[PDB]
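Build the 3D complex.
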Amino acid sequence: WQVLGECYSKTGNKVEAIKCYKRSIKASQTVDQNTSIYYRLAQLYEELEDLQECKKFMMKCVDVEELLEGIVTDETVKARLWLAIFEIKAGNYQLAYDYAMGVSSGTSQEIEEARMLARECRRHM
Amino acid sequence: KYGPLGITNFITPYDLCILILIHAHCSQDNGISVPTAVFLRLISPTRPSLEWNPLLKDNSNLRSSSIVPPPVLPILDNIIRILLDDKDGNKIALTLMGYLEAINGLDSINRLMMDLEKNCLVNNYRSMKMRTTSTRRQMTRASFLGTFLSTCIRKYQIGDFEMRETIWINLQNFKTVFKHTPLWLRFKDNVHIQKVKNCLLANDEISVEDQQMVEFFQHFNNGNDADSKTMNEENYGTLISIQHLQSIVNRQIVNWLDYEEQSGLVFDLLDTLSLNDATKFPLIFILKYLEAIKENSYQTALDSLHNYFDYKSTGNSQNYFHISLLSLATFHSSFNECDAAINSFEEATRIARENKDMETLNLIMIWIINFIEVHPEYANRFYITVEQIIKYLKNSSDVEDANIFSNAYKFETLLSMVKESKTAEVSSSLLKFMAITLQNVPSQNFDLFQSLVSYEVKFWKELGYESISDVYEKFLSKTSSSSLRNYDSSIINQDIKVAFKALEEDDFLKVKQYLLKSESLELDYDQKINLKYLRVKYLVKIGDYDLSMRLINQYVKECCEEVADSNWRFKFEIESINVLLLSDVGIRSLPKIIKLIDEYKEIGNPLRCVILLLKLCEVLIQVGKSMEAECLISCNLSTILEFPFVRKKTDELLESLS
Amino acid sequence: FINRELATPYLDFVKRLCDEAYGYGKLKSELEALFLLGEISCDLEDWLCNSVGEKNFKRWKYLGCEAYQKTVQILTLIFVPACERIIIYVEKLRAILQAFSIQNKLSYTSDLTAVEVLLKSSQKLLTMTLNSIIGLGRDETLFEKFFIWFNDRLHEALDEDYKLKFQFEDDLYFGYDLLSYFDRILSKKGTEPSSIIDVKL
Amino acid sequence: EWQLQINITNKIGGINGDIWLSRDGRSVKWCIEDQCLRQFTYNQKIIKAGYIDFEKTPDCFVVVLSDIAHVYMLKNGGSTTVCFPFQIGNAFWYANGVILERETSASKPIEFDLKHKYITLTDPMAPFGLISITNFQLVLFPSDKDKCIAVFLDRNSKVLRFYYSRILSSSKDIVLTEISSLKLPDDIIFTRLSSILSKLKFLSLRFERREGLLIFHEPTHFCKIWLIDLLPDVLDSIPFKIYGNSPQNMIRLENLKLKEPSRIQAMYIHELLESCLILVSEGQNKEEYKACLYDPFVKITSPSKNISEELTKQNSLPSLQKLFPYPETSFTKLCFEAVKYITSPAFNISFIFLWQSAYSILLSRANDDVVGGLKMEHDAFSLVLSLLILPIPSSSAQEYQEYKEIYERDLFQHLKQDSEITSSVLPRIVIGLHLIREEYSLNVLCRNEHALLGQFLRFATAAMGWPDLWQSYYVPKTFFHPLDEPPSITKSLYSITENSSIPLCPFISFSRLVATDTQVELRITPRSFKILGLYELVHSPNFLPDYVLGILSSFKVDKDELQTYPLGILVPLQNILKILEDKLSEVRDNLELLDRADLQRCSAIINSIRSDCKVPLAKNRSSKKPSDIYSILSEIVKSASGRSLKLNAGLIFSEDKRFTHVV
Amino acid sequence: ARALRDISLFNDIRKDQNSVKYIPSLSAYNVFNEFPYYPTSASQLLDGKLDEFLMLSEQYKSRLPKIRKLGWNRFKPIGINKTMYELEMLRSRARA
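Done.
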């Protein structure tokens, strides 16, 4: 099912690719395997100009990390960086500060992106 | 004559039949010369390679300038019927009959092979003239029969004893099939068979001892059925080479697309393939694909289409993925899917760039507007506007194009005709297309030649000159249609013309039933407008005008936004004029008619001005000022009789004025 | 013009190169034997080397090619626009006389049977012109396929070491087109000057 | 041989198409009448063929195999395919989805499951749902969205279960609650599940809020109809649904009021006539079959005595469906609708019956005189009402012989015996038709049939003896009539006008004598309502020409609606708009009723910006020597192998030589 | 394929105005040696398609001398310490 979603995504059929990934999520036996799908699924909603809808899926992918005693995986690193960036535009600096700190153990570019964001929100905190 | 079919890289029983004839012709002992027409029908299908793309090209070179007889199936019944036709053909047919009876063993088969190579075949003509002591005719390698016989000889030394055993088992199976036929009974006894048979059986070196048991080896192997036969593997009834099979199918699909052929025999044999020949001969799959379109089967056609493009791509070392998608896009356009074809075609452009080959883009670009020509409503969806392509193809190159420019100019003509450009430019542009098409061969490029006739009839019919249109109309081909536009489009188009005739003949019952079919059929855009236009004219005849008047203007409004078709904007406009003035209120149409009069005076199309003239006179006669209409019609009466189809409206007005 | 400048000079070249040297009926049987078997008699080799040779062969192609490619040009660029213009003028010719038959209301009338005959006749010519143009298109295809093979035969006779570049395997029905050219160029109907086009009609 | 299927798709009224099955369940053909459209072949047994919608507004044809479903997009898109948890016995369509029944038993042991055998799916990609039932094969389901009754029969018990299914969307998707039950006759014996279901036949009928279910069994000649009235208060009651209690008055079971109900061959639903009318086929001999019409809700039945022998087959259903006549033109439809809106359903349905009979007789009588058109239905219309209003002549009269075939029919006798309906309803029909004629008077494109009505209405007046004012209203120069004066738009419009000599007068429309909301009146006479409202607003003392655009926009008036007016009403408004052609330059919305492209294009540009949609570029219609043939070919073969900005620069700066000098 | 130059008209005007990698197929791979067959010349590649008869003809032509060429090189009889490859080498030098 996940492969079918990629083909639809690559052919400009965003309306169908949304439904394809949701079916894949149910078939997965373990929640941890849904970490990769959630981030890509959130991106497709971002291409479907509705930023509010993709927030709920961004909550779930990030929350899986907490439910897995801090899995700290790569595809959640991009989730926290994107989530914190949007929270700055929402004016809630306090709710965005912890997101940067939690992702401070990723790649070289990941940590610096959150570190500068941490300084920005701390000043307005 | 039917049997299991199998591809063979060895001596088919058919190959020896030609070998039998060439032996008699060259031996010159019997004075029997095989007619040149007989050889050209038998050897020529065996000649290697013709090639045929699925679509994107129709009979570009496959068409023969001279009509050729169909290739002959590998059954002794069919081959004899060729020779048998002549009054003296019994002599030629019996010569083959005697030889096939003389060859009772594999060693005898080897005798024929040895005779031809040592004496008959000759390396070059320079040794021909020094071989004047030969009592038999000699052949050069480069000749028509020489190159054939060289391949047959090469095809004989290539296999082991297993190859020759299969040779003799099938020929006896091939021979005994003809024995249980009505034709053999007519030739049960012919006395000449014994004479020709004894000519070659002589010098047998034994007639007392070996021949009693020579018979035993054959009879025991053969199915005497006195006891249970010796058990052997199942053997194919007919053996054909790849090249021979290629010629039959290519002839069959061409004959199906638009001396009697055997459709039943060819189809049955092709259905018994062992699934490995189909891989070596991918064209068997598409033969189903053309058949699948005929009954309008969706799922069946797609599997065959996909199948043909899996086997062909791997065999050809060149990349052919950029050709598969568009053909699938073409198939999608055939079922009026339209939108699904667009997404499939779009990905074809990206793959072509990866190959970095220039020649394929022209094939892609040509396919662009051919699809837009059938469906002009999608011109906005493409990433390239139609005008951009014409500018590119006009200055594409000066060599290695041949047909590109012939294609390029016709697309400009359609846009100019649709754009209602000045008649001076349209004629000049059409002149460019007519001159380049007829300069090269028009017969081979049958598709563009038909498109020339369709434009020229349409162009001149728009001018109002049916006399010119009639001459070109006799050359437009019917039921031929074109690729990528359905398969029943020809039947529908023929049905539309019948309906128009029915409206004139007041067959309102027939057209009413047809209009019911219109709303739930899938029609091409050009077909949509005609039935869309047909519906308007029928409602005018009935008398109800409130629905028609609200209906006609929505059509023209979407005939100016969805498609910028000016010709259909004009043709739709005049019925609204006819609707108004027929309801005794034509003054409302006075502002509308005059905007078209001066507009078409600059254009200069005489048919357009006069039709508006009739509506203007008709307006003036229903107001009570018929006096000046008579004066106006009198000055222009000379120039309005030149158009035939308006005379009926013109003559009818004359008795009204009286 | 085409009968005097394009048709006749090509056919006279063919007749002089073939009938005065070897003969028509005899030539046809040997070439089919040459095509099928490659048998060149002593007399035929003289015809290839001495009668035809290299010098006339290039002239034969040059005379032949202009006999067809210039023939197609004059049918499309002259006959087709002209045929349209005659029919255009006759229709306007018919309309004007009909109008004064009504406008004047003069007692005496002039019959229109003369114009209709020209109209149908003019329509007949244009249909007849297009039949020839398609036919000459086929003639061009037959013409080229003959000489590409005839080039091979001629040079092999004069060189004995010629390397055959063209291959018969390129086309499947190569034999039928090659033989069909012989019938058109060598026959009783072919001997007539109307072999290229039906000039008399 | 090919077999036709009866019901395939829920399209709230019907769809034009056919489905053909082969001699075995391996081929489905979507032929229209004789043209073979999309054809699908399968190795497995095919259960049913679709074309239903999937709650996403698609138009897709679905074929269900034993365990695999193929969903082919016809309107737009490609094809899809879905799997299923287990084998499927049968599949039944319902509004926005399919109901799937498990395969019960196969071998000969007979074992089956009962806990859950039904699957609901909305669209192919989404996961399946489970049905809900509250206090057993589904013989029939309410495929149509409008009707809401499901029938369940459990084998051993031989009893029926009637429920009120309501569809639930965004797992339980459908809920069923029992209302009543029916006991099958003992003579009915059923023995291959489809073959068992084949013998029994059920149909879905609906009019207004009443529903009837037709249960028919040919071998035992058992025929009954179960009726329910869908009251909004009763249905929405919470105890009604969960507890299943139902008042006994609402439930009723009755037979057909036919002459020989035990000799009915087969019945079908009239596709062309959306109402309760049902096709009834009866036979008196092996070579003749008589067809008649009957209404379930109202006891009115139609004596037709139509003979059709070879048409009784299923595969010949469309021709049979096309056998009975209905007005297919655009004129009498509004007349029939007006009759329906002003008369009782029983008189209404009897009127279509009588009109169809009269239509058939005239088609038989008229031997293709010239063409045959709208005059055919008008003559049928005119003669039916004339016979209703004219007293029946003596049997010896010539007019009796010519129209004898209509006289002896039971309905015409009943429709003339009923004194009350002839007393009051007929003036209502005349007044309604007069208002229809008046409405045509405002549409200039349809004067012809306008005048036609006049003639007949005159006859109606001459039949009824109405005051000479009504009769003289048509000349250039015993029921009780309610209206003493004819109502006219033109008279009332001249009344509502400045400098009006005639006093104030209302149009007294039929919105009050129809006893129905103005929404129903709007779809019948829109022009009258549009013009009345427009001149109610314009002739106000506080009216300015600026608001006229808003009034026209609010009244759904377009360019075409404006150009169709019999002078009069038309004349001022163009000039009013003409006035707006001069002083209007500030973009004040709804520019499309104007004819100026610049204002509408700028408004479209502004609307795109406000929203943040068609930037249609204007093609430059450029336009001289014709030259010769040879020059054109030479030019093309030659071409085969800042300027504007500089022009702007010559226009941006002018009146001096400064730029050349500085360069 | 007239290339716009085989047309006499447009050819005349121009004069006046002047004033492939190979990849193996599935059938190409053979059973005995894992090395695939490589065609020698473009003539055996028929429009990009490998002729099964032509390739198998070359295979027979290759294997045929291989039987005669058996005794060359490695093979050594008993009693002779020099193989027959250089028997003909010195024999060639003998007359020359």
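The first strand of chain B starts at residue 5 and ends at 7.
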